[PDB]
Design an enzyme around this catalytic site. Structure first.
Site, PDB file in Angstrom:
ATOM      1  N   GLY C  30       1.372   5.383   2.753  1.00  0.00           N
ATOM      2  CA  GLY C  30       0.052   5.006   2.258  1.00  0.00           C
ATOM      3  C   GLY C  30      -1.098   5.456   3.138  1.00  0.00           C
ATOM      4  O   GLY C  30      -0.900   5.941   4.254  1.00  0.00           O
ATOM      5  N   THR C  31      -2.309   5.285   2.620  1.00  0.00           N
ATOM      6  CA  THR C  31      -3.539   5.651   3.318  1.00  0.00           C
ATOM      7  C   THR C  31      -3.809   4.738   4.523  1.00  0.00           C
ATOM      8  O   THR C  31      -3.464   3.560   4.507  1.00  0.00           O
ATOM      9  CB  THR C  31      -4.731   5.647   2.331  1.00  0.00           C
TER      10      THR C  31
END
Lengths: 244, 233, 244, 250, 243, 198, 242, 111, 241
Positions: C30-31
């Site tokens: 994920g970011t």
């Protein structure tokens, strides 16, 4: 989730048999043999306890023969724990019937209900079946003396003489050989003991290894009487027939 | 390897993927193409309808949610019926209780949260449909993209379905042109029809083939099918 | 035979829950997002990957508010993070309903912690695919927390998770060393922009959009508020300038 | 969240074996030796306190438990399973009997209820059988003194004397040579200590051996005087000091 | 032939492997704890390791205040530890409300060991990978130490130790109680009992400690509390002057 | 109210039931059959609250008929009456109790004896030589106390019934429009068509 | 094993796709829509000559203006028909009008995906999809004569002509060539009979095949054997002519 | 004890011609002897050329109108935008009204 | 709480559990039904493996559902009791609300519906039972004979057989039953039923049981002596030609 661990107790085999019913029937074939014989003047229930021990109390013990009613009794083959669960519901059913109709439950009606409870664990619920086969002995004013059997499948049938548990094939052949219709109770007592003696896996058939019961009509009473033989009484009847 | 981790939505793969969700995403890519785009005044849906035979009707891709909001579908149509029905109730609740037109932003949040609960529960499958939601609320024209994973994105324009990469490149290249089409519904439909034909390969878009919807400042959400779309061919 | 990783609540022979470890993998994919605790408040920042020019700027908000005083940011599966905040929001409203006072941050942290832990107790549920960084201001001081897919959480001076977590932590540790007595709210916002820009090298192939929020006693009155316009542009320029 | 184990975890194998029950009995075989002997005027039950650490206080762990003032239990197998069974057995004695009849259940009837709880763990969805075998010693007005054994299957048998657990094979043989129907209670306690000495390799005293009796009524244990029809409990646990007295002459 | 190791059902040997693998989980944190009893107090010591410099040390704790009189130290992962803590806090409050007096150390222990047993028997619940040590000064039994595991087992202790290096602490204490003959620490003040516990942690582990390496909980008549870094710091000066 | 009479003689049980159905100020019907055959040798008459009356009788009828098929056998009059009582005994402590009083008239083929059972709405059962429900009893009980013999023929039972009906037609305030009479014996249940003009 | 509502890597529901294979084993059913009415025909397919053919009920009435033909596991159709009739009658009760054919079909299709072991959103008790496809023919004041193919997938297509069952693709290729918008009812009847005759294993007669139509005037009727027999006689005379 | 009903006064009137219909109603709203509003619209347009009023207890009147209007909305959603005929609206209202047969709307209603 | 889907589709389109339920029926004792002009006759075989039975009390294979309709079956006996019971309740329920006994078609459709329901419900297996339902509608003198099976499919038959060796007896009936002129008498119809079972049973003096149902609730079971007389006559026919 849980799907990975489900045995699926209530499914058909490709052959059309129910796995768990078949395997429970295989379990019963190892349990102590029980024998019921119906005569013109009463019914006999005999059962062989398993293995035994010197210290095993026989006085207070009653593991294979059970009283359901004042007129109905059962011989058990299989798990005693499973049997007691079914025995209690059968006891309740007979009392519900008596409360409703002010009459003692007919033998078939009681059998059909228990055989219906067993059938259920076969079709729904995903639980294992009861590993129990019953021999029912009873009396009512409709069919008189009656002998039924039921197994984990929920199937029940009527019999003149039948066996459950171990070595039933050998026991049925022997009963098929010596049983006749105009038999007396005292003759049926003899047949039951002789049959058990011939199919035993043990050395000598002794009193501490047997449970015995009769449903006879009082030889003077006119009413129906249940008699669970007490240790000393079986010891006596074992000398009568000639096994000492 | 993979066969062990795609049995249900409850299971994570060793790399952290949810294969059941990813397989549901494939139903969208197999679905017929549909496009959405907007300016500051209006928002437009364009869809290519698919048939089974030349004796069958063309299955509808656009569904009205309220007087100010609607959507186009790609993938499992029954799932879109389920999700559009839910969004109809949520729009209906907002009006009856608060006398308020539901904002297109929380419209997407409700869709996200509803799809999420299917990706974590045993026994439930993910939805097998992608959705393009257009609207006009108190903050103007809006366009949303919905994925069965739960991910929802606000965009000026996008496309989903088979060969949809063609249309998405066109919109990405023509962004500055159509965003300024304000007060002209017809010139936005034009920019939508030209986008969808960038995804054609087999058939030619025809009278019973094309489906268009519009919403905006002084335009309630209305569907155009049949001979009503003939002028854009 | 193995397969200890195929079901949630299962322990491996070495005491591990492999499904939770696989959820962690989704978070790392994920970011990147961060949290910086200052002298009287907390600052949250997050990376927003611009996949296409078609994404409307300032519109896909990732940071969320619970109540009026708490901020939440997360990396990994977004829908899971949204789910967790809906729970956080319910849990806080419940606390306010009974105790009148807005929920203290340590109290709020445990509520999410017990909820996430619950999702690692049963095979009929999937662990959460998010690490959540969150906090705010209560009756005594400011608090910052990080919540793992396992349910594990601690208080932090600075927190990082996601794609560029290594770059961020290294940067956060230098801030803890250089500012022993504390950092100001204004300074933390600016520095949060710097960390995100430096952590973006892990996704340097795509363009990104910055998103900041803060909750500070003297700067926001202890309320959660998004950084907008002039203050945001000041932070962006600070990061743009300190990159060469 | 919710339980999706609504199916049996104990099923019949092709051979007719109930696997989980068979395995539970294996666990009982691994457990410490416990025993029970029935005399003419009392019943004795005894076990070894196998301590997990010399830092542990074995006084805080009772392997022998009171169920009713006239009924006691002991086990071999899994300790925690025993503890929860004792709780349920104490409760069922009230709910199914005492709250109905105003008196405590006879030994056989309580055993029957305990067996029912164990049978259910054999058939119900999503549970394993109990990993214990119990010995239950008791007295009631109409049946006198009795001793029963309860297995993981839910089966139960009456015993003159028996042993369960580790060295139960050797203990049963030791009891066979020594038991008779003319034993006094003091004799039975003596045999119990001797039988248990063949099991214990380590220290053998009142601190490492747990013993309790079902004997005479104990008015000094009742807690109150007044009602003449109440004469005290028949269950008595012997103290560390009371055990050592019978070991000095042994 | 496989799935008897995934859920809490018997193996052919009569073993529950999921319970055994839960015991393995208790050591994951690599932290050792010990507990001793004084004349009228009970002390718990736990190792405090804060490796990450980004952490707030004051929030890293495995000692919990269950009630006014009971404290609990955990060996195991924090999510399961906090699960156990909250339940214990809830069960303690409920006991006091229902029965009109504060829940005894040993009674709470039994209750938690019973819950742990349930996860050992029912399939959908996993055991918790924690060992729970409860301490108090009971108004009847005096200073108390009661410990529960994932097997649902529980017992009272003279003293106890838990963790990866449990055996070192254990034999060290055993040797002291063979020497002293009495089954507690003969000291009037709790301050000197805390010192004893730290001294015998150092002498058993072989490592020195600073104010941030330890975590101390003390139980006196009608009060359980945890020492601040400074209270430990004061306690660490006291041992250095004697040796 | 409704007239419901029963009398047990030597070898049969006779049931007489009024034909009127009255609501408000109007007699809606003068040919109502207030009876149901429960089994070939068992008959039940009923009187009470408007709807409850027929609804209860048919419910009982269905259950007994279901029993007969299941067992290929006919329950004794005693067993049927015990069943009815328990249904009413359940009823009084329910949300809305059946307000129905019944008479069970049966011939027990096993005992070879006629049997009559009076059960009121509370579930009060009693076996009687003769019985009546409602206000009818206030006249007939004393009349039957005088004229009844336990060894009477079916024809003597019918003459005795006529005497009860002539008395109720003379003294009761309402017009109940005569009675339908049924005989239960070893041959089953038959209806006496010529009673109203004998 | 593997869950009931599980997606394939290709993006399909296993159970729905397998259900579609069960329908391919069913008896042939043909619907033809014209401006004079819609014609529904089925193959009876009796397993034995002892089987009394006129008890094979594969054409059912839903309402006076809506009829239904079935193919696949026809026992699965009972509860679908029961629902349909109830929906039609209930609509007339709430609204004092006739249900639209499209709404009726949509109602039937709302049941189709109500299978599984616990789908989030709505509690749906059904262990598997229906193993039967339906042809729903009718008339309403808005869209006139209509023909719908209702699948176990939940989707329903409108057709001018449609064939379902064991001979479905051969019949559909045939219907493609034969159907035009100016077909009379009598031509549509003979056309159903023609295609059935082609795909059936047995020789077609009034006993092993059944016809029905739905018209605005007379509603939905099932043809008695004597009527169909005369149409079979008439059809053989036409094929022989050219 | 709490009375769930009240009386808001007002009167409504409907007349039908050959190719038109009218529905009228005063705009006064009352409670006991006080005036609540001199202008409170009581007759409503409901779509599909149906006008409706439910006079009596206003809270019950506004509930019904609101509930029926929503019924018209869902009818379009469920039946391909079909116009609800006046006889269909009438029958649909009966089911709304009778749906509270044991806690009625205190309204006289005309469409 | 147990709702596991047990009846599900296989890759080629079969419900294996329903298919395996049929295999249980194939194992059950043979059952046959033939309708005459003014009667229906039901034949059943009885097992010879164990024969120390009490025939008085043993459940008979032919069960009355109502005074005018009978049900025989092939398959799992225990399963049949459930179907029979439900059918007997519906019969009494039907009489109660409609004030008329069930038609044979109605009762059949009910039983078929119960059977179907167990093929798409969670946590249940299909009935391992096929039934033959026979009788006369109220006031009607036309004979009715129906067959149900585990899938819930039902249909009416001039003549049908189910159970073990049903292939052989169906073969027999197919070439010996004429729809043009059915068995005109009760005597004729009974004989044809016994003839069919004599192909399968092999000398069934007591192993064959016949029940005859006539119009207006006239149902009677045949004794051993009466059946044996048909057996005696039929075997003499062969040796003449």
């Amino acid at each position: 989730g849980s799907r990975r661990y489900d045995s699926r107790t209530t499914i058909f085999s490709p052959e059309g048999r129910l796995y768990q019913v078949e395997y429970a029937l295989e379990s019963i074939s190892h349990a102590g043999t029980a024998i019921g014989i119906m005569a013109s003047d009463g019914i006999v229930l005999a059962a062989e306890r398993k293995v035994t021990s010197t210290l095993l109390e026989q006085d207070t013990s009653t593991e294979k023969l059970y009283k359901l009613n004042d007129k109905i009794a059962v011989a058990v083959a299989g798990l005693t724990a499973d049997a007691e669960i079914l025995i209690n519901t059968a006891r309740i059913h007979a009392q519900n019937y008596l409360k409703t109709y002010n009459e003692d439950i007919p033998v078939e009606i009681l059998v059909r209900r228990l055989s219906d409870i067993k059938q259920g664990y076969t079709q729904h619920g995903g639980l294992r079946p009861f590993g129990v086969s019953f021999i029912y002995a009873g009396y009512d004013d409709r069919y008189g003396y009656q002998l039924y059997t039921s197994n984990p499948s929920g199937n029940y049938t009527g019999w003149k003489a039948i066996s459950v548990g171990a070595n039933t094939s050998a026991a049925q052949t022997l009963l098929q050989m010596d049983y006749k219709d105009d038999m007396k109770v005292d003759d049926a007592i003899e047949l039951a003991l002789k049959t058990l003696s011939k199919t035993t896996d043990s050395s000598a058939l002794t009193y501490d290894r047997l449970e015995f019961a009769t449903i006879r009509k009082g030889a003077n009473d006119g009413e129906v009487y249940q008699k669970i033989f007490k240790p000393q009484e079986i010891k006596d009847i074992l000398v009568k027939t000639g096994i000492t | 390897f993979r066969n062990n981790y795609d049995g249900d939505t409850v299971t994570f793969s060793p790399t952290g993927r949810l294969f059941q969700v990813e397989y549901a995403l494939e139903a969208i890519k197999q679905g017929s193409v549909t496009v959405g785009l907007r300016s500051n005044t209006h928002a437009v849906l364009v869809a290519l309808k698919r048939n089974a035979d030349e004796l069958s009707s063309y299955q509808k891709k656009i569904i009205k949610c309220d007087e100010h909001m609607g959507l186009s579908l790609a993938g499992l149509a029954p799932d879109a019926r389920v999700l559009s029905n839910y969004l109809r109730q949520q729009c209906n609740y907002s009006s009856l209780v608060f006398n308020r037109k539901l904002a297109v932003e929380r419209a997407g949040h409700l869709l996200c949260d509803k799809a999420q609960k299917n990706t974590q529960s045993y026994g439930g499958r993910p939805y097998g449909v992608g959705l393009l939601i257009i609207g006009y609320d108190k903050s103007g024209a809006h366009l949303l993209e919905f994925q069965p994973s739960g991910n929802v994105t606000e965009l000026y324009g996008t496309a989903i379905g088979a060969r949809s990469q063609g249309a998405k490149t066109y919109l990405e290249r023509t962004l500055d042109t159509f965003i300024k089409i304000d007060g002209n519904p017809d010139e936005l439909i034009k920019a939508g029809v030209e986008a969808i034909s960038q995804s054609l390969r087999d058939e030619s878009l025809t009278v019973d083939n094309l489906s268009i919807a519009i919403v905006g400042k002084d335009t309630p959400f209305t569907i155009y099918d049949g001979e009503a779309v003939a002028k854009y061919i | 035979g193995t397969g200890y990783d195929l079901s949630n609540s299962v322990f491996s022979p070495d005491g591990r829950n492999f499904q939770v470890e696989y959820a962690v993998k989704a978070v790392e994919n994920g970011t990147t997002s961060i949290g910086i605790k200052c002298n009287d408040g907390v600052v949250f920042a997050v990376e927003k990957l611009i996949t296409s020019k078609l994404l409307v700027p300032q519109k896909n908000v990732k940071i969320q508010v619970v109540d009026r005083h708490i901020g939440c940011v997360y990396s990994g599966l977004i829908p899971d993070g949204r789910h967790l905040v809906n729970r956080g929001r319910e849990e806080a409203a419940s606390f306010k309903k009974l105790y009148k006072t807005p929920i203290p941050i340590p109290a709020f942290a445990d509520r999410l912690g017990q909820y996430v832990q619950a999702h690692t107790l049963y095979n009929s549920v999937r662990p959460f695919g998010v690490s959540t960084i969150f906090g705010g201001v209560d009756k005594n001081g400011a608090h910052l927390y990080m919540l793992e897919p396992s349910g594990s959480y601690w208080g932090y001076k600075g927190a990082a998770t996601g794609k560029g977590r290594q770059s961020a932590k290294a940067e956060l540790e230098k801030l803890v060393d250089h500012h022993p007595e504390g950092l100001s709210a204004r300074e933390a916002v600016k520095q949060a922009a710097k960390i995100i820009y430096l952590a973006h090298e892990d996704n340097k192939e795509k363009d990104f959009e910055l998103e900041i929020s803060w909750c500070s006693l003297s700067e926001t009155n202890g309320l959660h508020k998004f950084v907008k316009g002039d203050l945001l542009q000041e932070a962006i320029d600070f990061a743009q300038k300190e990159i060469n | 969240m919710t339980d999706r184990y609504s199916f049996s975890l104990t099923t019949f194998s092709p051979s007719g074996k109930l696997g989980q029950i068979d395995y539970a009995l294996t666990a009982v075989k691994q457990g410490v030796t416990s025993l029970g002997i029935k005399a003419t005027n009392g019943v004795v039950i005894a076990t070894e306190k196998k301590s997990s650490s010399p830092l542990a206080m074995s006084e805080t762990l009772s392997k022998v438990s009171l169920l009713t003032p006239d009924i006691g239990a002991v086990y071999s197998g899994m300790g925690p399973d025993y503890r929860v069974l004792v709780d349920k057995s104490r409760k069922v004695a009230h709910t199914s009997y005492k709250r109905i009849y105003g008196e405590y259940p006879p030994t056989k009837l309580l055993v029957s209820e305990v067996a029912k709880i164990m049978q259910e763990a054999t058939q119900s969805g999503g549970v394993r059988p109990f990993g214990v075998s119990l010995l239950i010693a008791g007295h009631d007005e109409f049946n006198g003194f009795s001793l029963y054994q309860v297995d993981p299957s839910g089966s139960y048998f009456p015993w003159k004397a028996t042993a369960i657990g580790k060295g139960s094979v050797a203990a049963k043989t030791f009891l066979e040579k020594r038991w008779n129907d003319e034993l006094e209670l003091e004799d039975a306690i003596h045999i119990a200590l001797l039988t248990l000495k063949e099991s214990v390799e380590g220290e053998f005293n009142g601190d490492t051996i747990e013993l309790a009796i079902i004997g005479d009524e104990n008015p000094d244990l009742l807690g109150y005087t007044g009602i003449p029809t109440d004469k005290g409990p028949r269950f008595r646990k012997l103290t560390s000091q009371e055990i050592n007295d019978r070991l000095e002459a042994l | 032939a496989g799935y008897d190791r995934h859920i809490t059902i018997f193996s052919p040997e009569g073993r529950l492997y999921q319970v055994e693998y839960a015991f393995k989980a208790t050591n994951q944190t690599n932290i050792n704890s010990l507990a001793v009893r004084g004349k009228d107090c009970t002390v718990v010591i736990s190792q405090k390791k804060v490796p990450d410099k980004l952490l707030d040390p004051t929030t890293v704790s495995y000692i919990f205040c269950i009630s006014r009189t009971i404290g609990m130290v955990v060996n195991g992962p924090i999510p399961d530890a906090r699960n156990a803590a909250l339940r214990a806090k809830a069960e303690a409050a409920e006991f006091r409300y229902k029965y009109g007096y504060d829940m005894p150390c040993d009674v709470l222990a039994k209750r938690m060991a019973n819950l742990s047993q349930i996860y050992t028997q029912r399939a959908y619940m996993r055991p918790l990978g924690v060992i729970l040590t409860f301490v108090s000064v009971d108004e009847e039994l005096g200073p108390s130490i009661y410990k529960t595991d994932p097997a649902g087992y529980y017992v009272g202790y003279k003293a106890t130790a838990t963790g990866p290096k449990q055996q070192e602490i254990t034999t060290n204490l055993e040797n002291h109680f063979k020497k002293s003959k009495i089954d507690h620490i003969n000291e009037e003040s709790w301050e000197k009992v805390v010192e004893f516990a730290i001294t015998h942690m150092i002498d058993a582990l072989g490592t020195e400690f600073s104010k941030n390496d330890l975590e101390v909980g003390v139980a006196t008549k009608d009060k359980f509390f945890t020492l601040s870094a400074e209270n430990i710091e004061e306690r660490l000066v006291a041992i250095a002057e004697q040796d | 109210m409704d007239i419901i009479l029963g009398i047990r003689v030597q070898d049969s049980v006779i049931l007489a039931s009024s034909k009127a159905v009255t609501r408000g100020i109007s007699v809606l019907k003068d040919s109502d059959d207030k009876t149901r055959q429960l089994s070939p040798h068992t008959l039940m008459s009923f009187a009470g609250e408007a709807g409850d009356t027929v609804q209860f009788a048919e419910y009982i009828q269905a259950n007994i008929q279901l029993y007969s098929i299941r067992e290929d056998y006919e329950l004794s009059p005693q067993a049927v009456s015990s069943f009815v009582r328990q249904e009413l005994a359940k009823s009084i402590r329910s949300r809305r109790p059946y307000q129905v009083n019944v008479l069970i008239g049966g011939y027990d083929k096993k005992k070879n004896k006629p049997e009559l059972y009076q059960i009121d709405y509370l579930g009060t059962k009693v076996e009687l030589p003769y019985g009546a429900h409602g206000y009818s009893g206030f006249y007939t009980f004393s009349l039957l106390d005088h004229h009844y013999r336990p060894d009477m023929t079916t024809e003597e039972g019918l003459d005795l019934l006529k005497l009860c009906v002539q008395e109720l037609e003379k003294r009761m305030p309402m017009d109940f429009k005569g009675v339908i009479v049924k005989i239960v014996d070893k041959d089953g249940i038959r209806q006496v068509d010529d009673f109203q003009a004998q | 094993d593997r869950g009931v509502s599980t997606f394939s890597p290709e993006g399909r529901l296993f159970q729905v796709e397998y259900s579609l294979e069960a329908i391919k084993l069913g008896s042939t059913a043909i619907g033809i829509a014209t401006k004079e009415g819609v014609v529904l025909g089925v193959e009876k397919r009796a397993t034995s000559p002892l089987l009394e053919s006129d008890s094979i009920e594969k054409i059912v009435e839903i309402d006076r203006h809506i009829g239904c033909a079935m193919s696949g596991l026809t026992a699965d159709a009972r509860s679908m028909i029961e629902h349909a009739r109830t929906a039609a009658v209930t609509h007339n009760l709430y609204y004092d009008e006739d249900i639209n054919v499209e709404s009726l079909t949509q109602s039937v299709c709302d049941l189709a995906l109500r299978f599984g072991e616990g789908a989030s959103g709505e509690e749906r008790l059904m262990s598997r999809p229906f193993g039967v496809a339906l042809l729903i023919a009718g008339h309403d004041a808005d869209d006139g004569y209509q023909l719908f193919h209702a699948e176990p997938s939940g989707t329903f297509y409108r057709y001018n002509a449609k064939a379902i069952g064991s001979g479905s693709e051969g019949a559909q290729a045939e219907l493609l060539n034969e159907w035009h918008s100016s077909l009379t009812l009598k031509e549509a009847e003979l056309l159903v009979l023609k295609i059935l005759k082609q795909v059936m294993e047995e020789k077609l007669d009034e006993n092993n095949a059944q016809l029905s139509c739905i018209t605005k005037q007379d509603g939905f009727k099932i043809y008695d054997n004597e009527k169909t027999a005369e149409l079979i006689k008439e059809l053989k005379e036409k094929e022989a002519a050219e | 004890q709490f009375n769930p009903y009240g009386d808001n006064g007002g009167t409504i009137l409907g007349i039908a011609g050959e190719d038109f219909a009218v529905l009228a109603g005063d705009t006064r709203n009352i409670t006991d002897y006080s005036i609540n509003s001199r202008y409170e619209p009581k007759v409503f347009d409901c779509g599909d050329n149906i006008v409706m009023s439910a006079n009596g207890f206003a809270a019950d009147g506004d509930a019904l109108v609101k509930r029926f209007k929503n019924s018209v909305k869902w009818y379009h959603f469920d039946h391909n935008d079909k116009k609800l005929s006046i006889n269909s609206a009438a029958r649909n209202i009966q089911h709304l009204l009778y749906g509270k047969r044991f806690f009625p709307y205190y309204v006289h209603t005309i469409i | 709480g147990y709702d596991r889907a047990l009846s599900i589709f296989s890759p080629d389109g079969h419900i294996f559990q329903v298919e395996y339920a049929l295999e249980a029926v194939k194992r059950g004792t043979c059952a046959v039904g033939v309708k005459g002009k003014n009667c229906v006759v039901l034949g059943c075989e009885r097992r010879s493996t164990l024969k120390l039975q009490d025939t008085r009390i043993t459940p008979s294979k032919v069960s009355k559902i109502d005074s005018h309709v009978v049900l025989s079956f092939s398959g799992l006996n225990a399963d049949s009791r459930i179907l029979i019971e439900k059918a007997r309740v519906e019969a009494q329920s039907h009489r109660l609300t409609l004030e008329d006994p069930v038609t044979v078609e109605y009762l059949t459709r009910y039983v078929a519906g119960v059977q179907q329901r167990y093929t798409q419900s969670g946590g249940v297996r299909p009935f391992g039972v096929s039934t033959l339902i026979a009788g006369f509608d109220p006031r009607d003198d036309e004979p009715k004979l129906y067959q149900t099976e585990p899938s819930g499919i039902y249909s009416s038959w001039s003549a049908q057989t189910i159970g073990r060796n049903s292939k052989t007896v169906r073969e027999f009936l197919e070439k010996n039953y004429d729809r043009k002129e059915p068995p005109a008498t009760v005597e004729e119809c009974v004989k044809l039923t016994v003839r069919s079972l004599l192909e399968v049973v092999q000398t069934g003096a007591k192993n064959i049981e016949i029940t005859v149902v006539k119009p207006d609730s006239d149902i009677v079971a045949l004794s051993s002596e009466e059946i044996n007389q048909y057996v005696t006559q039929i075997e003499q026919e062969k040796q003449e030609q």
